[PDB]
Design an enzyme around this catalytic site. Structure first.
Site, PDB file in Angstrom:
ATOM      1  N   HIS A  89       2.240   4.567  -3.153  1.00 17.80           N
ATOM      2  CA  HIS A  89       2.560   5.973  -2.959  1.00 17.80           C
ATOM      3  C   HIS A  89       3.854   6.252  -3.710  1.00 17.80           C
ATOM      4  O   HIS A  89       3.974   7.265  -4.394  1.00 17.80           O
ATOM      5  CB  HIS A  89       2.737   6.280  -1.468  1.00 17.80           C
ATOM      6  N   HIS A 149       0.831  -1.196   0.000  1.00 20.59           N
ATOM      7  CA  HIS A 149       0.000   0.000   0.000  1.00 20.59           C
ATOM      8  C   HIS A 149       0.868   1.249   0.000  1.00 20.59           C
ATOM      9  O   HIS A 149       0.452   2.306  -0.463  1.00 20.59           O
ATOM     10  CB  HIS A 149      -0.882   0.060   1.238  1.00 20.59           C
ATOM     11  N   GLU A 150       2.062   1.130   0.556  1.00 18.61           N
ATOM     12  CA  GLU A 150       2.969   2.259   0.623  1.00 18.61           C
ATOM     13  C   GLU A 150       3.739   2.398  -0.669  1.00 18.61           C
ATOM     14  O   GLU A 150       4.023   3.506  -1.102  1.00 18.61           O
ATOM     15  CB  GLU A 150       3.934   2.073   1.786  1.00 18.61           C
ATOM     16  N   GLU A 183      -4.693   8.485  -1.299  1.00 24.08           N
ATOM     17  CA  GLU A 183      -4.798   7.225  -0.580  1.00 24.08           C
ATOM     18  C   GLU A 183      -5.580   6.183  -1.381  1.00 24.08           C
ATOM     19  O   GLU A 183      -5.151   5.039  -1.506  1.00 24.08           O
ATOM     20  CB  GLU A 183      -5.464   7.458   0.775  1.00 24.08           C
ATOM     21  N   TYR A 242     -11.340   2.954   3.859  1.00 15.77           N
ATOM     22  CA  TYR A 242     -10.270   3.939   3.920  1.00 15.77           C
ATOM     23  C   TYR A 242     -10.196   4.733   2.637  1.00 15.77           C
ATOM     24  O   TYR A 242     -10.183   5.963   2.629  1.00 15.77           O
ATOM     25  CB  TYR A 242      -8.893   3.266   4.113  1.00 15.77           C
TER      26      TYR A 242
HETATM   27  C1  LIG Z   1      -1.088   4.120  14.882  1.00 19.24           C
HETATM   28  S1  LIG Z   1      -0.889   2.406  15.343  1.00 19.24           S
HETATM   29  C2  LIG Z   1      -1.780   1.450  14.081  1.00 19.24           C
HETATM   30  C3  LIG Z   1      -3.154   1.487  14.060  1.00 19.24           C
HETATM   31  C4  LIG Z   1      -3.918   0.715  12.991  1.00 19.24           C
HETATM   32  N1  LIG Z   1      -3.917   1.681  11.945  1.00 19.24           N
HETATM   33  C5  LIG Z   1      -3.674   1.714  10.657  1.00 19.24           C
HETATM   34  O1  LIG Z   1      -3.379   0.813   9.878  1.00 19.24           O
HETATM   35  C6  LIG Z   1      -3.879   3.141  10.222  1.00 19.24           C
HETATM   36  C7  LIG Z   1      -5.363   3.476  10.403  1.00 19.24           C
HETATM   37  C8  LIG Z   1      -5.716   4.333   9.201  1.00 19.24           C
HETATM   38  C9  LIG Z   1      -4.821   3.801   8.085  1.00 19.24           C
HETATM   39  N2  LIG Z   1      -3.629   3.373   8.819  1.00 19.24           N
HETATM   40  C10 LIG Z   1      -2.395   3.380   8.318  1.00 19.24           C
HETATM   41  O2  LIG Z   1      -1.446   3.145   9.063  1.00 19.24           O
HETATM   42  C11 LIG Z   1      -2.156   3.635   6.829  1.00 19.24           C
HETATM   43  C12 LIG Z   1      -1.634   2.346   6.159  1.00 19.24           C
HETATM   44  C13 LIG Z   1      -2.761   1.325   5.959  1.00 19.24           C
HETATM   45  C14 LIG Z   1      -3.353   1.188   4.694  1.00 19.24           C
HETATM   46  C15 LIG Z   1      -4.461   0.341   4.520  1.00 19.24           C
HETATM   47  C16 LIG Z   1      -4.975  -0.375   5.612  1.00 19.24           C
HETATM   48  O3  LIG Z   1      -6.084  -1.153   5.458  1.00 19.24           O
HETATM   49  C17 LIG Z   1      -4.372  -0.248   6.875  1.00 19.24           C
HETATM   50  C18 LIG Z   1      -3.263   0.598   7.046  1.00 19.24           C
HETATM   51  N3  LIG Z   1      -1.183   4.730   6.658  1.00 19.24           N
HETATM   52  C19 LIG Z   1      -1.102   5.429   5.524  1.00 19.24           C
HETATM   53  O4  LIG Z   1      -1.812   5.228   4.539  1.00 19.24           O
HETATM   54  C20 LIG Z   1      -0.036   6.523   5.506  1.00 19.24           C
HETATM   55  S2  LIG Z   1       0.959   6.431   3.966  1.00 19.24           S
HETATM   56  C21 LIG Z   1      -5.370   0.607  13.465  1.00 19.24           C
HETATM   57  N4  LIG Z   1      -5.795  -0.625  13.709  1.00 19.24           N
HETATM   58  O5  LIG Z   1      -6.072   1.622  13.599  1.00 19.24           O
HETATM   59 ZN   LIG Z   2      -1.499   5.886   2.451  1.00 21.02          ZN
END
Ligand SMILES: CSCC[C@H](NC(=O)[C@@H]1CCCN1C(=O)[C@H](Cc1ccc(O)cc1)NC(=O)CS)C(N)=O
Ligand SMILES: [Zn+2]
Length: 732
Positions: free
Chosen positions: A646, A642-643, A691, A684
């Protein structure tokens, strides 16, 4: 260190629990009996002492002697190892089964020529260990079950015939732990035969001939994994439990006896955090901030989990539809950074020892430091004492602080007391070493644990390893400890099932290096397979926590799959772009807001972020956490891709107007795609195009075709757009 133990220490355990009672010529009668009992691991002999059990070497009808004449005609037909029916007052050995462990063996001239009798003896001993001792610490269990099953389902159907009973063979399905509960009287039985055979020399070969792992169990269990039991036994006896405690308590009875009321207060503070008072927040908020605070539906925010908001809410009441606003958000974003309970140990875990990291305000970042260097100093007295050799300290943990991912399946949905086997293996998997960069607070004597706590460590300290004594029977360890997972098996304890972990403390070095040495290898490889400069820094490891061993071996598969799911053409092109700007692939386990690749580039601090993964244009680096779970994302790898999306979205754009660099998704053509179908994919994805593209992407290149289709079924034009830049970049 060698003789010092078994021969001269034995003679001691010999005089205490080994009792003789012959008639005449009190001489060699004690030899075969002393020889006989020598072949057995002295450590099981000490345990027999534990549950309190004496041994009697007599003459004639063994039943004709003192300790055994009670049991009536009720228990008079004892079966032998083989299964025949040798009677008591016609036999030569027995072992009383009761709250007063007794074992009687008749005398004999020399068991050398003979071999089938010593066997039986050794067999009854078995029954002892397998029914009077281990039964008191909850063994045999899953480890030994696993060996019984391998025995039933395999090539040769003879090894079964050797240990299995007239009914263990027939049982339909594999033996379920629940089975160990209902047919136990039978299982123990088996673990015993296995002991004897292994113990009785000549019969040992037969065991290594028709007994697959069954032999390997005893081999291990009787040379190295036995003490670890005698110990557990010992950690259930009182006088001893406190015997040890006071023994340690004493060794520090000079340290603890010299502490400033600022010192103790420093220790305690460390034990319990301290959420900041309302009153302080308010006054330090200022004019325009306090006033804005008055009209801000907190519940209209995404970030700021329950715990937090439900706190900021109390300020509106003491001060006396969905879309918010970004100048308002700023505020909440700031408060998030002030409403955090001051936690020393939690701070170290986040920064991973990197305490000088701009992850928080300045006034606070500096306190944690003063305090810390102060705690490191209060801890200078090493455990190593002259009143005890190996010291096993225990600690209970929540598998979530190790791997959120597995922690969501680790418990079995229907029977909360059981551990889902599959999950267990994927955890036990690449776990070989563990780091501790915060102050490990452990208990001198294993004490029960909470619920999220299902992992039960059992640490062997380094006499070097310095620590601090605590009043309640606990010890606070130095920071930056190096552990070393030596054995992980599942166990039952107090009506429940827990995961026992056995580690040995070792210099962080030993471990810190295994990490670099590896970080090196993984690059001295993914460059060849990419045509990059072998002396380049593509992959990078940032590891400092308790589940280290895996944060590395997982990196491999993550990339090892990110590859087997995308045209090697796209990769190379893109990752050279990344490489060109010192870009990096960071597989780390410290709060993300603590990676140079993100904070060297953030304007204000409240802007930093934390999550499973993240990509930042500026440093062109992909950051991947490890101890967490993306909104239901089974595999870590996924998120890694997913990254990458980007990354791709960056190179394309780049490729459009070579210098006015702007992400491809900021196109007038895309927004016109994000608008239409740009809301029929992931919960998301519904966020923003940048995204969405990344979400869409990831699916278009997942492992599960099932996921590849939907994108094309509900997001057509996108499947055209994304797969469009691809064929563009591959040409560049
Ligand atoms: C901050 S600790 C991790 C928390 C975990 N979060 C994630 O995976 C967060 C929530 C919203 C999307 N998240 C990301 O980390 C995404 C990565 C991601 C993508 C898809 C997915 O289904 C889950 C995480 N980051 C980015 O897109 C920044 S480039 C959660 N269970 O809420
Ligand atoms: Zn992202």
């Amino acid at each position: 260190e060698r003789n010092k133990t078994q021969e001269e220490h034995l003679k001691e355990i010999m005089k205490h629990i080994v009792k003789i009672e012959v008639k005449g010529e009190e001489a060699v009668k004690k030899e075969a009996a002393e020889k006989l009992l020598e072949k057995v691991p002295s450590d099981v002999l000490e345990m027999y002492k534990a549950i309190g059990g004496k041994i009697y070497i007599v003459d004639g009808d063994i039943t004709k002697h003192i300790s055994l004449e009670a049991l009536s005609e009720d228990k008079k037909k004892i079966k032998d190892i083989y299964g025949k029916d040798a009677l008591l007052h016609e036999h030569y050995v027995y072992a009383k089964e009761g709250y007063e462990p007794v074992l009687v063996i008749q005398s004999s001239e020399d068991y050398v020529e003979n071999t089938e009798k010593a066997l039986n003896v050794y067999y009854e001993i078995g029954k002892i260990l397998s029914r009077d001792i281990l039964s008191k610490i909850n063994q045999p269990y899953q480890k030994f079950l696993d060996v019984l099953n391998t025995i039933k389902n395999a090539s040769d159907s003879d090894g079964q015939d050797l240990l299995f009973t007239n009914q263990l063979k027939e049982h339909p399905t594999d033996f379920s732990v629940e089975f160990l509960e209902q047919n136990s009287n039978e299982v123990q039985e088996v673990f015993a035969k296995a002991f004897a055979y292994y113990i009785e020399p000549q019969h040992r070969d037969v065991l290594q001939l028709y007994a697959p792992e069954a032999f390997n169990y005893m081999d291990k269990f009787n040379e190295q994994e036995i003490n670890l039991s005698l110990e557990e036994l010992k950690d259930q006896r009182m006088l001893s439990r406190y015997e040890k405690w006071e023994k340690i308590k004493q060794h520090y009875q000079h340290w603890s006896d010299s502490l400033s009321e600022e010192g103790r207060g420093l220790l305690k503070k460390l034990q319990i955090p301290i959420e900041p008072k309302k009153d302080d927040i308010i006054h330090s908020l200022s004019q325009e901030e306090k006033e804005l605070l008055k009209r801000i539906q907190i519940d209209s925010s995404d970030f700021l989990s329950t715990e937090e908001k439900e706190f900021l809410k109390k300020l509106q009441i003491d001060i006396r539809s969905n879309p918010l606003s970004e100048k308002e958000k700023e505020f909440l974003k700031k408060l998030k950074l002030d409403i955090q309970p001051y936690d020393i140990n939690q701070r170290l875990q986040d920064t991973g020892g990197l305490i000088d990291s701009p992850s928080i305000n300045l006034d606070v970042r500096k306190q944690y430091k003063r305090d810390i260097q102060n705690i490191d100093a209060l801890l200078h007295q090493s455990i190593g004492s002259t009143l005890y050799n190996k010291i096993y300290l225990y600690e209970n943990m929540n598998i979530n602080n190790l791997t959120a991912t597995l922690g969501a399946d680790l418990v079995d949905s229907t029977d909360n007391t059981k551990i889902n086997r599959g999950i267990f293996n994927e955890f036990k998997k690449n776990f070989k070493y563990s780091i501790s960069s915060n102050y490990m607070i452990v208990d001198i004597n294993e004490r029960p644990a909470l619920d999220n706590e299902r992992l039960k460590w059992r640490i062997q300290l380094s006499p070097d390893t310095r620590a601090g004594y605590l009043e309640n029977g606990k010890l606070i360890l130095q920071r930056n400890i190096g552990l070393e997972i030596k054995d992980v098996q599942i166990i039952k304890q107090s009506e429940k099932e827990y995961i026992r972990i056995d580690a040995k403390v070792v210099p962080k070095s030993k471990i810190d290096t295994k990490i670099q040495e590896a970080q090196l290898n993984i690059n001295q490889e993914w460059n060849k397979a990419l045509g990059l400069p072998k002396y380049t820094k593509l992959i990078t490891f940032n590891v400092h926590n308790r589940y280290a061993s895996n944060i590395v071996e997982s990196a491999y598969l993550i990339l090892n799959e990110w590859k087997n799911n995308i045209q090697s053409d796209l990769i190379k092109k893109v990752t050279n772009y990344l490489v060109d700007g010192n870009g990096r692939f960071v597989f780390t386990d410290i709060t993300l807001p603590n990676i140079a690749e993100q904070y060297t580039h953030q304007d204000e601090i409240y802007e930093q972020v934390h999550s499973k993964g993240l990509y930042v244009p500026e440093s062109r680096s992909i950051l991947l956490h490890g101890p967490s779970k993306g909104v239901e994302l089974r595999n870590d790898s996924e998120g890694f891709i997913h990254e990458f999306g980007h990354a791709v979205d960056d190179y394309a754009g780049y490729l459009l107007d070579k210098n006015q660099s702007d992400l491809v998704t900021n196109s007038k053509k895309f927004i016109d795609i994000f608008k239409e179908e740009g809301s029929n994919l992931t919960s998301y994805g519904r966020t923003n195009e940048a995204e969405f593209f990344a979400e869409a992407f990831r699916l278009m290149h997942s492992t599960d075709h099932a996921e590849r289709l939907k994108v094309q079924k509900n997001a057509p034009k996108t499947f055209q757009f994304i797969n469009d830049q691809i064929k563009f970049i591959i040409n560049s």
